[PDB]
Coordinates of C-alpha atoms and ligand atoms in Angstrom, one line a residue:
X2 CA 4.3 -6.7 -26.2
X3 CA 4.0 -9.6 -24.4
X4 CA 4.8 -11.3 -20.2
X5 CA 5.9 -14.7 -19.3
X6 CA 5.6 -16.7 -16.6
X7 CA 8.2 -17.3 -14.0
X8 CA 9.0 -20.7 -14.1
X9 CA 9.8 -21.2 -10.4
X10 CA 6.7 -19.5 -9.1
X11 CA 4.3 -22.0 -9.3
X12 CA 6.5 -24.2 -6.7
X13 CA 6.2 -21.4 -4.2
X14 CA 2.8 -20.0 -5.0
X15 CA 0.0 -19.1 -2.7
X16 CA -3.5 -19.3 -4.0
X17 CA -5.9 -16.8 -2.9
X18 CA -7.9 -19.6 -0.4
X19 CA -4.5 -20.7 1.1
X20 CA -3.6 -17.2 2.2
X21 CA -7.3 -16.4 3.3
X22 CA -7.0 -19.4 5.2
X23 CA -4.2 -18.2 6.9
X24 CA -5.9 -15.0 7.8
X25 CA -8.8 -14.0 10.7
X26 CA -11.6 -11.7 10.6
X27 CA -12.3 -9.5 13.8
X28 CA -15.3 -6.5 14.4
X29 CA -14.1 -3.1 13.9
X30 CA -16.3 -0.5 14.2
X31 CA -19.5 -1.0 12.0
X32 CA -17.7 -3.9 10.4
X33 CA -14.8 -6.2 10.2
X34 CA -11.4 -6.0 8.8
X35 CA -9.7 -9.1 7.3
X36 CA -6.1 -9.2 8.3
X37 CA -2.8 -11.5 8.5
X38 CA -0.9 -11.6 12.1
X39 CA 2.3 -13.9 12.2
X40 CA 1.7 -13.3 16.0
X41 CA 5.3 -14.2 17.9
X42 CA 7.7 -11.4 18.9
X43 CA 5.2 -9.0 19.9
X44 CA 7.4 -6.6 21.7
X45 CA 7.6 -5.3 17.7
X46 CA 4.7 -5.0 15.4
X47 CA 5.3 -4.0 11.2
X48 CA 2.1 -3.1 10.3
X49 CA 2.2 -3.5 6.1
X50 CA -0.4 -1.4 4.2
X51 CA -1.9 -2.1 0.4
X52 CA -3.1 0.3 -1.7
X53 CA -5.5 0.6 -4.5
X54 CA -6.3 -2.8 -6.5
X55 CA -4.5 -4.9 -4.2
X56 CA -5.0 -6.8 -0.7
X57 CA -2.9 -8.0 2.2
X58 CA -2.3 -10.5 -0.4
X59 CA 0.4 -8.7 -2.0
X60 CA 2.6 -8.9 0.9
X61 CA 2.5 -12.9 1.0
X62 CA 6.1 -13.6 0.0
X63 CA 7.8 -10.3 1.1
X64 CA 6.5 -10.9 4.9
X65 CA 8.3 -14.3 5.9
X66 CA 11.3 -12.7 5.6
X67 CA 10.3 -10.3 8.8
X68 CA 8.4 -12.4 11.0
X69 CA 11.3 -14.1 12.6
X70 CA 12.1 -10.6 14.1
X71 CA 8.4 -9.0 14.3
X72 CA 5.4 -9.6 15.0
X73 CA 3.8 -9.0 11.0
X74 CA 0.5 -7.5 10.9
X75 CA -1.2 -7.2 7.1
X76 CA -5.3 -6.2 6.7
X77 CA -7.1 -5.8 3.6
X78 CA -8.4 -2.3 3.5
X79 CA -12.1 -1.9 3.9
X80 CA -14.0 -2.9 1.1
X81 CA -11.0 -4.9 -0.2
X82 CA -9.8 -7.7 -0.4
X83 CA -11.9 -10.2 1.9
X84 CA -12.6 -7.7 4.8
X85 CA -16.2 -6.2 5.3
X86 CA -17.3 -3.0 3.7
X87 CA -17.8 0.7 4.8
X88 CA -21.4 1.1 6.6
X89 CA -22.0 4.3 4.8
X90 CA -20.8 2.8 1.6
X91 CA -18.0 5.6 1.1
X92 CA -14.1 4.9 0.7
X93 CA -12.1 7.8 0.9
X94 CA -8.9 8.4 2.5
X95 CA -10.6 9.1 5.8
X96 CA -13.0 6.4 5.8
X97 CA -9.6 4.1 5.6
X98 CA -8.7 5.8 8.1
X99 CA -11.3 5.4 10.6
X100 CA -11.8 1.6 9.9
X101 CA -8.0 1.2 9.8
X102 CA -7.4 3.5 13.5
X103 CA -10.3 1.5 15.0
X104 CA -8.4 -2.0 14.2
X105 CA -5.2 -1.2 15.6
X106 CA -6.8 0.3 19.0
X107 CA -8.0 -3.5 19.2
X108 CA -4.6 -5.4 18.2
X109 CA -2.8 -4.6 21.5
X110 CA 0.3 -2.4 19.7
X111 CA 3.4 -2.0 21.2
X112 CA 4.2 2.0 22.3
X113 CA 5.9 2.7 19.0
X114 CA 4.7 0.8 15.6
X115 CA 6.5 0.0 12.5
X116 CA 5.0 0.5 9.2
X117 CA 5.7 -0.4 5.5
X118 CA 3.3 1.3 2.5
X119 CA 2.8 1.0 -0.5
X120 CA 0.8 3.3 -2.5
X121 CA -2.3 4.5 -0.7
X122 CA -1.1 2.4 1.9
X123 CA 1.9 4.6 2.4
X124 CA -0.5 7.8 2.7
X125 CA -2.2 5.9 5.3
X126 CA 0.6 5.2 7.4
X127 CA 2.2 8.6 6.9
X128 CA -1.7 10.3 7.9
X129 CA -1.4 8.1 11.4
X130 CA 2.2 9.1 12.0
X131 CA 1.5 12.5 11.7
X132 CA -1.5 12.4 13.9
X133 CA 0.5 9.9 16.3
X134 CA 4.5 11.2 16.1
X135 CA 5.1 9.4 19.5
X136 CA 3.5 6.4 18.1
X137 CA 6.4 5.7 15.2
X138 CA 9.4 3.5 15.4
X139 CA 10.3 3.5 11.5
X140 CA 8.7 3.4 8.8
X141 CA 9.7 1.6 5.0
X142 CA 7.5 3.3 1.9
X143 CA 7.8 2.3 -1.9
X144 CA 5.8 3.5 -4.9
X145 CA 4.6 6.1 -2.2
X146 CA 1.9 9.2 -1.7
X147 CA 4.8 11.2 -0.6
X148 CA 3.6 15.2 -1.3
X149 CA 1.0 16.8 -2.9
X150 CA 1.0 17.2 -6.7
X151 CA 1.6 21.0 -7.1
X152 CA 3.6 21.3 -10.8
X153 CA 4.8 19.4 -13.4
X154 CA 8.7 19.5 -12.7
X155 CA 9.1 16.2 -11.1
X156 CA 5.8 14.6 -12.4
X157 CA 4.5 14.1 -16.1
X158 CA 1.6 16.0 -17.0
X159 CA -1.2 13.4 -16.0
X160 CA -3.7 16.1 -16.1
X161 CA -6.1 14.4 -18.8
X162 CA -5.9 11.3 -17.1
X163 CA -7.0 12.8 -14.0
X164 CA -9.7 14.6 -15.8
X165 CA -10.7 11.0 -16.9
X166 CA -10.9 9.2 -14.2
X167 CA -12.8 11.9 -12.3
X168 CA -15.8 11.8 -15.0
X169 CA -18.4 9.4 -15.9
X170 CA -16.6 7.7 -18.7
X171 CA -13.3 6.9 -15.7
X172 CA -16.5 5.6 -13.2
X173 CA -17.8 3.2 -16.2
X174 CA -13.9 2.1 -17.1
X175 CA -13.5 1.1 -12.9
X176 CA -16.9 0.0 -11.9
X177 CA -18.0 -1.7 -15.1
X178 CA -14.5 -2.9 -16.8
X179 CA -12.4 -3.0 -13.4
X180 CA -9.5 -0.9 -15.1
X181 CA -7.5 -0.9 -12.1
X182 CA -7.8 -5.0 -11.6
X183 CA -7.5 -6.1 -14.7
X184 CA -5.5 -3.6 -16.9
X185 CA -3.7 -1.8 -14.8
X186 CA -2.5 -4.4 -12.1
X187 CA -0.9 -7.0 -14.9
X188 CA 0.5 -3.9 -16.8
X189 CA 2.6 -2.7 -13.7
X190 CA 3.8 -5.9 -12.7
X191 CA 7.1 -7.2 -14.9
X192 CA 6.6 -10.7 -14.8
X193 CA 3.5 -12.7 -15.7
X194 CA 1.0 -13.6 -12.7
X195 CA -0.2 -17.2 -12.8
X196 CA -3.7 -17.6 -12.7
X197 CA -4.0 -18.4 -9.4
X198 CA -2.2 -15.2 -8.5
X199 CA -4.5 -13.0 -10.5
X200 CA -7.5 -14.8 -9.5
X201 CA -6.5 -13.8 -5.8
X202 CA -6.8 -9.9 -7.0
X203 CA -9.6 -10.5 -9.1
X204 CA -11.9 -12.2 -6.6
X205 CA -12.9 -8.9 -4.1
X206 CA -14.2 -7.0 -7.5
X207 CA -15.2 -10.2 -9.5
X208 CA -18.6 -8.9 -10.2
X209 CA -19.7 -5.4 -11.9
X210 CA -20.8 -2.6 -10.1
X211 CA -20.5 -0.5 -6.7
X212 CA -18.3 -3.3 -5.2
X213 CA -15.5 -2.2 -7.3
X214 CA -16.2 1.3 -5.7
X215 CA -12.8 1.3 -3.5
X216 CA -10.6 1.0 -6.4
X217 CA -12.5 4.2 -8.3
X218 CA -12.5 6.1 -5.0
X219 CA -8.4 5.7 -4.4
X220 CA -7.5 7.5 -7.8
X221 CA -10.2 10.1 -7.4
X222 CA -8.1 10.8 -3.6
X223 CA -4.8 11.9 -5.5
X224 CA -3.8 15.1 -4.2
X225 CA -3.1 17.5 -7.1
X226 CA -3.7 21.1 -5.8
X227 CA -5.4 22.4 -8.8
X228 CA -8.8 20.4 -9.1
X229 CA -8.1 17.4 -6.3
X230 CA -10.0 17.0 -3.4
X231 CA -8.8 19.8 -0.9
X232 CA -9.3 17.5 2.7
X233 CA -6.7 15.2 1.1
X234 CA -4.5 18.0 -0.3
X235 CA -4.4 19.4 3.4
X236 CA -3.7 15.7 4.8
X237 CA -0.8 15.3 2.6
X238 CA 0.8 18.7 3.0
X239 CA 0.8 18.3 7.2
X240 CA 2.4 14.8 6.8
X241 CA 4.6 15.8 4.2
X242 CA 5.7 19.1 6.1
X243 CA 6.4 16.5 9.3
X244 CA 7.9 13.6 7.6
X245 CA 10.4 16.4 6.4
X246 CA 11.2 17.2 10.1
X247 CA 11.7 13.9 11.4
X248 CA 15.3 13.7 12.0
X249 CA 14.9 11.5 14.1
X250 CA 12.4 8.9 13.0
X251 CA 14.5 5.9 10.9
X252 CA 13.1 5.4 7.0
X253 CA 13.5 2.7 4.4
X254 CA 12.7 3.7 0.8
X255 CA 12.6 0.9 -1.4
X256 CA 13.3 2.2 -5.1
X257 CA 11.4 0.2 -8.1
X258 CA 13.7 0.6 -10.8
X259 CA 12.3 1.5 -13.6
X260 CA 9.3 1.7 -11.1
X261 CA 5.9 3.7 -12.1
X262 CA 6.6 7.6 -12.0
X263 CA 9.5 7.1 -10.0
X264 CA 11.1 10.0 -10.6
X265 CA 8.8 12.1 -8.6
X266 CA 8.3 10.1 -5.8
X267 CA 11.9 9.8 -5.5
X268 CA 12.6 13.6 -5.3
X269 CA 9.8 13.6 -2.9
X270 CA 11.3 11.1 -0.9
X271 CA 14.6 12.4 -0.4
X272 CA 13.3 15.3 1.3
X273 CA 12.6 13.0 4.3
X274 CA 15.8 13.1 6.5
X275 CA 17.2 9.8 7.6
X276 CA 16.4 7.6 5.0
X277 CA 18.0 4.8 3.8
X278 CA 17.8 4.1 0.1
X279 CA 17.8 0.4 -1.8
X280 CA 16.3 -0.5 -5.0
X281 CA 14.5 -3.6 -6.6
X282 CA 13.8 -4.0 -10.0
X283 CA 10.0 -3.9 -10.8
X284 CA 7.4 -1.3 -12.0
X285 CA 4.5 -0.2 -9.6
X286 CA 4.0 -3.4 -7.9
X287 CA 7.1 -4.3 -7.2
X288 CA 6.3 -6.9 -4.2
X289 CA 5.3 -9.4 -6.9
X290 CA 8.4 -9.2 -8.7
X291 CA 11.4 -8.6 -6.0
X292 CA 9.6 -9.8 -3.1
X293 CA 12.5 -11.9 -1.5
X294 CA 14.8 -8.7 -2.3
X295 CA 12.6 -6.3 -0.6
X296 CA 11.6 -9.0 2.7
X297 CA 15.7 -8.7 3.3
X298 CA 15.9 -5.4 2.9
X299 CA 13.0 -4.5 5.5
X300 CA 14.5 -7.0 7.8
X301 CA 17.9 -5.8 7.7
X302 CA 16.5 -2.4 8.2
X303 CA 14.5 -3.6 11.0
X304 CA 17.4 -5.2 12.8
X305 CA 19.3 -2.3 12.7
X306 CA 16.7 -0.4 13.8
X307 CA 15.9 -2.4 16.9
X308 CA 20.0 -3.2 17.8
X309 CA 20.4 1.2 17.8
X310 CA 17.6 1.6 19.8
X311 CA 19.1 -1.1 22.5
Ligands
LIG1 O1 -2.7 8.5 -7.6 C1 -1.7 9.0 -7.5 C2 -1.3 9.7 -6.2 C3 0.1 10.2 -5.9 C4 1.1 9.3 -5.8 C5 2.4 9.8 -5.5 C6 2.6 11.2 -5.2 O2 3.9 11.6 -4.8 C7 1.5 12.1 -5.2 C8 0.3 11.6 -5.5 N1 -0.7 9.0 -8.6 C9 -1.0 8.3 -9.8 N2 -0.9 9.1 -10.9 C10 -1.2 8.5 -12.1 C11 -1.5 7.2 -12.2 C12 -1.7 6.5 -13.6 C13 -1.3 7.2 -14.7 C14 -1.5 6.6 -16.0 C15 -2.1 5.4 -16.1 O3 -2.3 4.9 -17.4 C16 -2.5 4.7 -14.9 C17 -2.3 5.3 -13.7 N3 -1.5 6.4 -11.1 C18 -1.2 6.9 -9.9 C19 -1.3 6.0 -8.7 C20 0.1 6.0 -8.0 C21 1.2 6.1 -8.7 C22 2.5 6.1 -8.0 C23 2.5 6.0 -6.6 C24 1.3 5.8 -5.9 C25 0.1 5.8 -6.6

């Protein structure tokens, strides 16, 4: 089986230099963090979070949509995309998390923050919220880290994968093939990336080795309670356990329909109370083939949002 192209895209596209062009690098911590800010209408910030393979990048065409209301904020993760990389050379969940706590603290944030995650991203954004509950506006998640993995009743039985990826043979498939870059990126988008597009994603992990480290590290975070890593486990069960509880905090899921294990991450999802449900078409990645969908979705939400808050 076999992608096309869409034929529009190539009048639209952004390259991977025009959008790093368009983004600044600033210190944090140790490092730096590379990072998009559309700047006006600070009063608001949407902070958007990637997840594993990807980069601010992905967010290029969903985000116009949102600035005219909100200040858009978009890093690359450390160690991806073009930020720096993690002093001690380590990229778990919590290392994000220090890099990605230390940014904000210099970004001048409104009171209460809006977020929108994808993947890891989403696990990110839930970890802060849970840590800073007076800190949250709303938050939008998609293709989500929404609970812990604790059965197979929602999810398929991934457990040889897992086992895979957590060996040897999974560390040679990421660090010296770049599974998750080059098969599993273009298999999980619907449409066909032009080259420029894929060249974007390829260019943080272009060359073998420990650079590609962040996008072996991600998987090996999943939090299945039999066998993943129990810090992460624990994470996810106190956000999850809060997000159910948050009557009062407004949620946007965005459905990917047929989407990547979407089953599960729905159930999980509708445990959150408040949430308001819409649905793209797509697979995992679904900002590269609904963007302009999901950018008036989040800014409807948004609005609405900020006119019942008034
Ligand atoms: O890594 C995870 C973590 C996870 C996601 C959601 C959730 O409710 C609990 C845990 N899941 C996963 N599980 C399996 C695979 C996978 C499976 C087969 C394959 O060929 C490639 C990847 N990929 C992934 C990455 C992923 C999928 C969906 C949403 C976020 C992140």
């Amino acid at each position: 089986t076999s992608k096309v192209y869409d034929p529009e895209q190539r009048k639209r596209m952004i390259t991977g230099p025009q959008w790093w062009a368009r983004c600044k690098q600033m210190n944090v911590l140790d490092s730096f963090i590379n990072y998009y800010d559309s700047e006006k209408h600070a009063e608001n910030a949407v902070i958007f979070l990637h997840g594993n393979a990807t980069s601010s990048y992905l967010w290029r065409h969903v985000v116009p949509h949102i600035e005219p209301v909100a200040r858009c904020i978009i890093p690359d993760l450390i160690g991806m995309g073009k930020s720096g990389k993690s002093g001690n050379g380590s990229y778990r969940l919590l290392d994000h998390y220090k890099y990605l706590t230390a940014w904000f603290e210099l970004l001048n944030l409104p009171k209460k923050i809006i977020f929108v995650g994808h993947d890891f991203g989403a696990a990110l954004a839930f970890h802060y919220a849970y840590e800073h509950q007076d800190r949250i506006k709303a938050i939008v998640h998609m293709q989500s880290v929404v609970d812990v993995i604790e059965s197979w009743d929602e999810w398929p039985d991934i457990e040889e994968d897992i086992a895979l990826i957590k060996s040897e043979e999974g560390e040679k498939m990421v660090l010296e093939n770049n599974f998750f870059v080059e098969t599993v990126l273009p298999s999980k988008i619907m449409r066909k990336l032009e080259p420029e597009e894929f060249a974007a994603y390829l260019e943080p992990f272009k060359e073998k080795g420990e650079v590609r480290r962040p996008t072996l590290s991600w998987p090996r975070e999943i939090p299945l309670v039999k066998g993943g890593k129990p810090d992460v486990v624990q994470i996810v069960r106190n956000y999850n356990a809060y997000l159910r509880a948050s009557d009062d905090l407004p949620k946007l899921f965005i459905e990917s329909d047929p989407g990547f294990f979407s089953n599960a991450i729905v159930e999980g999802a509708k445990k959150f109370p408040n949430t308001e449900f819409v649905k793209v078409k797509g697979l995992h990645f679904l900002q590269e083939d609904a963007p302009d969908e999901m950018g008036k979705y989040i800014k409807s939400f948004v609005e609405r949002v900020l006119k019942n808050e008034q």
